[PDB]
Write a protein that binds this DNA or RNA. Structure first.
Lengths: 83, 108, 142, 98, 94, 98, 81, 108, 94, 138
DNA sequence: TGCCGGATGCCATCGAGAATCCCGGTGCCGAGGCCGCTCAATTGGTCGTAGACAGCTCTAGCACCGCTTAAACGCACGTACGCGCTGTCCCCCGCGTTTTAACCGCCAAGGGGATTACTCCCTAGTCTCCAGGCACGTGTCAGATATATACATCCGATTCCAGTGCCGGTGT
DNA sequence: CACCGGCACTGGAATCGGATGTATATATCTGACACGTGCCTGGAGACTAGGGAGTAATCCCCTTGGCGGTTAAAACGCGGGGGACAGCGCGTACGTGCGTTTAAGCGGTGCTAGAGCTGTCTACGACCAATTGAGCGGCCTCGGCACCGGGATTCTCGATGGCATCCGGCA
């Protein structure tokens, strides 16, 4: 199966909630597309690194260890998932 | 053959000296490992863990709770200067953020 | 090398960007040693009959700030003179602002204040400036 | 007949969401997005639940940090509304772009 | 099929400081990561210092310097005191 | 007497100093500062010349980068002059401040 | 040696700013610049002094300086290593 | 005995395979090292060096100069996106700064 | 009196191949020597991690090939990997 | 796994902040479908006899801009009508600006334009607005 | 007493003066080739182990289906906040003169680095072996959830007036 | 047209006041954790054997003062213009609330793909001994670049002449 048009799954109220956690009061109308683009870029980088890591191991399932290891490689260490 | 005593008991520690020694020797760090390195490393790790746990427990007591949850750890780490500097680039799952609102946003 | 007791715990300092806003309004001017321009019936009568532009120029002279059209008449009527004396840095700074006004605007300000519209620029300046120290009821019946 | 002042509900939401700890994005759309992105690099890939959980946690933390920096930049310019220029400046200074 | 963790040791330290306080399963997952993460940082720094001066062994001196390089001002001072006292006790009370 | 309008000489100096590569801080005062700072950590220390050279190069590069970021911050706020608030904001966003 | 931070003269800071593209400079920038430079130098010098202490030496070599700079994520080229 | 043939000549490389192999063996990276790793590492290093030097030579030629100075290396590095990404946190001594001025500061 | 070790000659050999009539300065070679070393520690360190990562003992071309793709940016990774593959294929056949 | 040819070389994009837009001496008079107020002798005569404040209010009505006292008389005299038609968004936006003027100021504007000072606010508005589309010599 | 008047205050375009390139002449020190050697790389043979390959077993990731219900989606309105225009004054830029110490070219002395020699403690490598730590099972209490309640703000009625069209009415 | 009155509504600020959000106090309920038990394999104890580094000399670099002599940079005033900051007004674009749509989460049921484990060989890299030529330290030489000066081209910017809205008189 082929997946298409899922970046629209990040609804505007979800972005509003994420912003409200950050302590903002007013959000302009053009923020949402920029936020979606930034999220897409970040996910692309992390997922590419994870896919390379799981490819070297000759496996077909992406483990949580690959994800935390890629995040560490990118300079964003994550705690609470076994590493 | 005398009765065995663990090296942690000899050094008066709680962390495992033998396990740390084995991890150092199998960790591809050096060809040889001295006798006093695992004791030092275990002592440092125990001190750091004790400090963090004390701060988290104080926060949990302040929040009128008995058990410690990741939110308390996040508060304790983020409210201390040295710990914040040490763990500046670390994300804690289910940690949340510190309550902070800019003064300008607050209404008159 | 070995130390005694616990370490000293320090707090984290967070950056705050000072607003420097609100903290009351400075539009109202300090009460001077004289009668309010609203109690002097004749000045209140002239102030009621004058255009918004004379009132803007007078509010700029009194309070150094542009007045909102609704407040403008209230703000000029509540003026009770200046709190400073002859020769103060504030007196000199008002005298220069009067010298910088066009002769027609000085004649319009004299007509708001029941001052005589006759004489030289320097006399209109002196007569307005003496009146703005001590606003006296001119006694002349309406 | 009773309407709340604009900005009040914003502050209520801020205080509510600066205290809770759960995730703020629906799980299924995020899963679909992750699978769609990953399908380009290699086909027929399976994911563990913990992997998607870790990805969501990291993404939410990164977005929250970016929004906080954007708020600081927007406050710097004597405004309360955040605009894409603030996001671009924050990303440029942080070193994530040239 | 054997998995190791710092579960018992973190609990032992917690009871020493707070006699009547518990801990959750999720809080422990974080503590295991924290202990490991500091372990690589100190060991990695100390491993370089041995290669650094053309040395083959890792002694307590390398760990002492590695601690001083990684920890902030006041934290490094007390951590060194804890290490020095433990080493002396182990050597004397052999 | 010939006199230039304010602004031309600044642009001329910008063009001049963006093209050359020599050091801009005199060597002796920097050497004295480095020795005074290093006094506190240990007494009677000795420094090779290359060490002081490396320290000077690092300091100049760091200051130039900081001033570039400060200029970006100041321009963002619709100004042309840099102020300490800009330096504070740049250091906060870069991560060198809590 | 006392009061050596005054050696970083105002024209030197002006030139450093001009290299970065600054067109106009406030009057209170110089104190902040001196403070920032002092903090950075203190950190780097402390790390270098620790590195040269471990080797039981008395003269700080440039190699310790470049290695400190690498430790703080400021890798420097052209000075050996 | 047969006449000696350097491994760099066998692989058609300019960088020394034996030197890289010795460095890998003595660097305490791993206890055993494969036969093909030095060839790969030498090829990668040679490719990167050639790629940088081509741009440096182009920049030096553009400035009516024969010999390469660090300013040319700085220009070549900062004017290429991939090399800039690879060397983001690297300072080049006597490198200078890329000439750039904000458009708002320009006169009207 | 110890022998000193550097990559001065090989950078010169590469330069002659690309620009036959362009010289280099002593200060320039100082930067090039550090660059070659810096990349060497980055690639080897990443490859060293992967071996302990999958519970393996030897470092072969596959570890170096994966480490290259993790470090280099998009277009650099494609060409560098092809360059390494050409070298190993020629070496194996000979 | 073997790539042919060279490698594409991209150019680094640097973030530049917006420079905005500014004007120094626009000197702009959008010429409309009518006669200049300076050629209509009678309007030029009334324009010569009117105070600076009527002229300021008229320059604010015509060009939406505060006029410098010296330019003010020239700028109003060179007005040749509006270039837009009845019912345009610009026509509606001028009609509202006329409805927002005090009855005394509308009567002063009628006297500048040789329009009758009599009738209801809405008629003074309609009569001025028709005249500002097509300034006709009366 | 009201014009008269010019009379500063407001737009133009030099050519001067300064800044910035471009090319011929001279020197010098750093870059580019040779030479010897010795040590690091190459070549040939052994061997014991790490890694590739061939099954088995299950665990869990994927796939399909109701349902119920909370969140997402449009739509209207109005009010605040973004943005542009204007004025001011005070702060920083440009230039000339006087101090001031950085920079450069030698002398000298001694601390501290760098390099061998000996050796002697200190740590790797093996065999036992037994006890501390890890999987499995459990039951009860701390936290989650549900209402009922009292307390704390928050926003827009009131009003109120002080202000004000316009309406309507009149000898000029 | 003009001129006044009264028949009209009109919005700043101080004062109660309901509406709604929120923290507090019991009452149930449940599943997650702290504990107990059996077992098993990894740390401890006792040795041997070989070398890594600590100490001691020995020698020579190079760091630190110390001293003059220029001369360019730094410090100090002094005007003076332009940019930061405040104030004001206008317009439209988001925040808030309401009614209608939809798919997220939950619980449940199957299916089979591959992750992990174990067993078997076997080719490859560590190890050792004997050669030998590649690169490094040392030395010598010459031309590419740094000045240095004479012209040669260009870039601002404060002088010319101009253009009508003041100020204090005077017949």
């Amino acid at each position: 199966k082929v997946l298409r048009d899922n970046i629209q799954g990040i609804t505007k109220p979800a972005i509003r909630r994420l912003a409200r956690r950050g302590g903002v009061k007013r959000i302009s109308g053009l923020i949402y597309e920029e936020t979606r683009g930034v999220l897409k870029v970040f996910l692309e980088n992390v997922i590419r690194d994870a896919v390379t890591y799981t490819e070297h191991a000759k496996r077909k399932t992406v483990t949580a260890m690959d994800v935390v290891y890629a995040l560490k490689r990118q300079g964003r260490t994550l705690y609470g998932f076994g590493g | 053959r005398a009765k065995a005593k663990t090296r942690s008991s000899r050094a008066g520690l709680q962390f495992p000296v033998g396990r740390v020694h084995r991890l150092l020797r199998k960790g591809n760090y050096s060809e040889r490992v001295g006798a006093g390195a695992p004791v030092y490393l275990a002592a440092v790790l125990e001190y750091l863990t004790a400090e963090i746990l004390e701060l988290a427990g104080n926060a949990a007591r302040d929040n009128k709770k008995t058990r410690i949850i990741p939110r308390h750890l996040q508060l304790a780490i983020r409210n201390d200067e040295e710990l914040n500097k040490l763990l500046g680039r670390v994300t804690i799952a289910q940690g949340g953020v510190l309550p902070n609102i800019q003064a300008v946003l607050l209404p008159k | 090398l070995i130390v005694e007791g616990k370490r000293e715990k320090k707090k984290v300092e967070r950056l705050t960007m000072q607003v420097s806003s609100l903290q009351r309004e400075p539009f109202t001017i300090a009460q001077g040693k004289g009668q309010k321009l609203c109690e002097i019936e004749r000045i209140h009568f002239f102030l009621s009959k004058k255009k918004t532009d004379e009132l803007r120029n007078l509010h700029k002279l009194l309070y150094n700030r542009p007045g909102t059209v609704s407040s403008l008449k209230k703000n000029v009527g509540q003026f009770s003179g200046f709190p400073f004396e002859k020769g103060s840095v504030q007196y000199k700074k008002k005298e220069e602002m009067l010298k910088k006004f066009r002769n027609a605007m000085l004649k319009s300000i004299c007509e708001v204040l029941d001052l005589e519209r006759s004489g030289v620029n320097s006399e209109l300046v002196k007569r307005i400036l003496n009146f703005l120290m001590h606003p006296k009821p001119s006694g002349k019946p309406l | 007949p009773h309407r709340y002042r604009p900005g009040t509900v914003a502050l209520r939401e801020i205080r509510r969401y600066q205290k809770s700890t759960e995730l703020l994005i629906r799980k299924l759309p995020f899963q679909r997005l992750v699978r769609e992105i990953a399908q380009d690099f290699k086909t027929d890939l399976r994911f563990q639940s913990a992997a998607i959980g870790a990805l969501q946690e990291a993404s939410e933390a990164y977005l929250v940090g970016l929004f906080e920096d954007t708020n600081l930049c927007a406050i710097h310019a004597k405004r309360v509304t955040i605009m894409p220029k603030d996001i671009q400046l924050a990303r440029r200074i942080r070193g994530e772009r040239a | 099929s054997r998995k190791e963790s710092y579960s018992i040791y973190v609990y032992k330290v917690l009871k020493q400081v707070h006699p009547d306080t518990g801990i959750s399963s999720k809080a422990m997952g974080i503590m295991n990561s924290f202990v490991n993460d500091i372990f690589e940082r100190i060991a990695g720094e100390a491993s370089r210092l041995a290669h650094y001066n053309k040395r083959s062994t890792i002694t307590s001196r390398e760990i002492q310097t590695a601690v001083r390089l990684l920890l902030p001002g006041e934290l490094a001072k007390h951590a060194v005191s804890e290490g020095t006292k433990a080493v002396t006790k182990y050597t004397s009370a052999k």
